A and B are shown apart, each in its own frame.
Chain A
Amino acid sequence: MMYVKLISSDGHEFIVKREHALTSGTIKAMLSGPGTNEVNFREIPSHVLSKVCMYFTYKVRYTNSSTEIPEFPIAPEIALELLMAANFLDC
């Protein structure tokens, strides 16, 4: 089970399954060319990066499900920062 460490601008570290972090085209690019298991985000704070990690978990659990799936919830207070992060991360 390969894990990767995603580090927020404010120094929180998030350890997620590599396969889950590859939901992000940006992270995929950043880890491309082994021939690296740590990624620093200078402009994504911890409250946003935490929520992004929950999206990765949600995406891998429910993509290609044959049946119903729940709504990914986003509080109004985080929506703009999460939009910026999602745009940056290509996920």
Chain B
Amino acid sequence: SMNPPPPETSNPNKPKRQTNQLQYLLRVVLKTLWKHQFAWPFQQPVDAVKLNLPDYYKIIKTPMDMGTIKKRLENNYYWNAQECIQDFNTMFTNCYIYNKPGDDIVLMAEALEKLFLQKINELPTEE
């Protein structure tokens, strides 16, 4: 269809890991963003068929959403905190690529990103 399969959340050929920083990213960072009033557009992959966005997956080469990130954390997909943080950044960046600078969805993403940056600023040192 217009819609590609979503990013993989589990890959047997990719080393799995857990650290106290990845736990914090699931239990504090992802949880806080997931519960935000404006999380809903970001909770699952962009459905370009339903939203009638025939160019979305032509413009966005590395799709990412918080549903994918949640499942990646819960399945220990990430090697370290940086890998997980990269996925959150990709999600924000994709929104900013596809949408106009004053768009409603961009203001929602900026609100989540501000909160995201505040929470990862308190990331525990690895221990």
Instruction: Let me know if chains A and B touch directly in the complex, using CB atoms closer than 8 Å.
Output: no
Q: Which positions in A face B, CB cutoff 8 Å? A: none
